[PDB]
């Protein structure tokens, strides 16, 4: 089983440095290139550069030279991205990706990791129970979520029940709030006949500000 | 650098229809081995890009026939010959042939489906929010079509302006619907001032608005 798990979400301060790390797994590590491939708005997906993970040996994109450092350890099968002189074109998700077949069209993908470059200051959010109630019913089901206000920069992942709900979940794009924070929600439609049974847990991260919270969703 | 483009920007099919996505290359993209390494990749929001199409026609592991590639020279073709609710997103090609390698655009593909009118739910602030000194309110519009509702929050039948936030859900992959979120937001002695908290929410499945509300302290 192949995977990459990259590092999460970072902000950094105009001028500054960050390394993006990318955690490889299920496959021998020196076999394939690691690439980089960046996403950010307007200017699209574009490709940064390989990493040949045997020699360290590194091929750029002209455009991202001087601006990316591409390294990797061996010894813990981790490829990693560094970007120097951050400034706020630099805000884009970072993805490491691999082509298992030996040729350059990729296959595998990393999560993603989001760098934001800005001058304003992390805050972690507040995280608030959408409690399921009369008003929130329909049809024998029951909504319910997490409001997660005032937080900066993105993202916020929210996963229910450690991953083990999916079905009838809806997290939704974020807002920029006049504060210049960040607000969103997140729902799940569930069964009302067992609310006095199952527990409703939303997982929420932060992982600019390191917030971890698991709020618990209680009825009302 | 080679400059990838695509043909249309955006589409709308009924399922079972058929879609065609071009993509152009500024300069020809044979490969040194006299391969053509073009892709087509497909991404969903909040998700890293999937392969469905590489060296023109190839389809990778799991890729439905319904998908198929051709092209030559410039001119590159993404063909569906049926369209499912799941093929919702942003399609990509890109070029491995020539260092360094570019990606096209994009082509968002939103699919066509019956009117679906909105389960509308409210959510008061939690008493947690409360003690902070502030009062949320959430409007849920949930499993819409189409993405056009209009929500309209009242306090004591007053119409409310400046005070709310919403955003939509991207297309669902599974039912083709949308979903609303939408936020009124005061301060704890405003929100006390007031009694009755309602969204009217407007939409083409609905004949007359609907409104979803509630008492404060019941």
């Known amino acids: 089983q192949v995977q990459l798990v990259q590092s999460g979400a970072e902000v950094k301060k105009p001028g500054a440095s960050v390394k993006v790390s990318c955690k490889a797994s299920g496959y021998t590590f020196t076999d394939y290139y690691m690439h980089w491939v960046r996403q950010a708005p307007g200017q699209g997906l574009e490709w940064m550069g390989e990493?040949?993970?045997?020699?360290?040996?590194?091929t750029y994109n002209e455009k991202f030279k001087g601006k990316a450092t591409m390294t990797r350890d061996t010894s813990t099968s981790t490829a990693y991205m560094e970007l120097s002189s951050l400034r706020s074109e630099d805000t884009a998700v970072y993805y490491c990706?691999?082509?298992?077949?030996?040729?350059?069209?990729?296959?595998?993908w990393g999560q993603g990791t989001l760098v934001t470059v800005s001058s304003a200051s992390t805050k972690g959010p507040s995280v608030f129970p959408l409690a399921p109630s009369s008003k929130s019913t329909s049809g024998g089901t029951a909504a319910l979520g997490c409001l997660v206000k005032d937080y900066f920069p993105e993202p916020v992942t929210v996963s229910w029940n450690s991953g083990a709900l999916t079905s009838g979940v809806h997290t939704f794009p974020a807002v920029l709030q006049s504060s210049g924070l960040y607000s969103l929600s997140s729902v799940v439609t569930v069964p009302s006949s067992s609310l006095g049974t199952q527990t409703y847990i939303c997982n929420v991260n932060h992982k600019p500000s390191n917030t971890k919270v698991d709020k618990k969703v209680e009825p009302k | 650098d080679i400059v990838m483009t695509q043909t249309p920007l955006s589409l709308s099919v009924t399922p079972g229809q058929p879609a065609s996505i071009s993509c152009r290359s500024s300069q020809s993209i044979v490969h040194s081995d006299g391969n053509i390494y073009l892709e087509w990749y497909l991404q969903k929001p909040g998700q890293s890009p999937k392969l469905l199409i590489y060296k023109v026609s190839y389809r990778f592991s799991g890729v439905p026939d319904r998908f198929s590639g051709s092209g030559s020279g410039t001119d590159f073709t993404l063909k569906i010959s049926r369209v499912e609710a799941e093929d919702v997103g942003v399609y990509y090609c890109?070029?491995?042939?020539?260092?360094?390698?570019?990606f096209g655009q994009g082509t968002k593909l939103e699919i066509k489906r019956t009117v679906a009118a909105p389960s509308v739910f409210i959510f008061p602030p939690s008493d947690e929010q409360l003690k902070s000194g502030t009062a949320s309110v959430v409007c849920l519009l949930n499993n819409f079509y189409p993405r056009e509702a209009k929500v309209q929050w009242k306090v004591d039948n007053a119409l409310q302006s400046g005070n709310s936030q919403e955003s939509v859900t991207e297309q669902d992959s599974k039912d083709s619907t949308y979903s609303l979120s939408s936020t009124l937001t005061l301060s704890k002695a405003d929100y006390e001032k007031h009694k009755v908290y309602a969204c009217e929410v407007t939409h083409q499945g609905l004949s007359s608005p609907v409104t979803k509300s509630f008492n404060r302290g019941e």
């Open positions: 990493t040949n993970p045997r020699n360290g040996g590194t």
């Open positions: 990706t691999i082509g298992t077949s030996g040729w350059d069209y990729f296959d595998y």
């Open positions: 890109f070029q491995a042939s020539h260092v360094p390698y570019t």
